[PDB]
Amino acid sequence: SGKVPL
Amino acid sequence: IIGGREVIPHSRPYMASLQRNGSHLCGGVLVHPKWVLTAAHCLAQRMAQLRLVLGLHTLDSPGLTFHIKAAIQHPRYKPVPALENDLALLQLDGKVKPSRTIRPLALPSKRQVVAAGTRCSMAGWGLTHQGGRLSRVLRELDLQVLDTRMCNNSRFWNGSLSPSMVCLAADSKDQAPCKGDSGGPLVCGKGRVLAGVLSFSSRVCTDIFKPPVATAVAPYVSWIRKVTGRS
Predict the structure, then answer these.
(1) Which of 1-6 (A) contact B at CB < 8 A?
(2) Which of B76, B123, B132, B140 has its CA 20 to 30 A from that of B205?
(3) Where would I find the Peptidase S1 domain in this sequence (chain B)?
């Protein structure tokens, strides 16, 4: 789905 | 960091703020007098405008500023959607002289394991609320390592966490690293040993079904030593 970089 | 605590000033002298035109972008860890370890996805930028600032507590404050001579991304870095090997080493354009406010954190053994249950913490200047703003002061948050298999559950990270990734949870549902916090170090145990570099979460920082994840340092220690030239 959605890995969002921190 | 959402729901974290202000650190004691200079209590984490290995902290780096990676900044673009004076504006904080990601944390880093000083791992050598000439090298900051950080997250690779942080360098999707014009380097000409990036600086590393050391010894900071308050974000708008001088600290000690370095230009970057080189940004070496892990050879097998894969950006989103697969955020694999999300590490870069940044070479400072000077050489840090260890002092009370600025000092490298040692790499762990190459055979360190970060077992489920390990008590750790991390630090950063990242967002304090969803859709909010950066923290003015360096903050910290206790995190515990979660079982990777449980983190890979269909409702959680759905099979997408590799063996090199460290799945993490705060003591409370409303505490989480947030934007600006990636690149910063995860330190574990009583000896507060370097164990990871924060990487990613989901778009909502406190989403309980998408726990934050850090890249484990130990499997990359030999790459780091090769790059830094210090065997």
Answers:
(1) 1-6
(2) B76
(3) 1-229
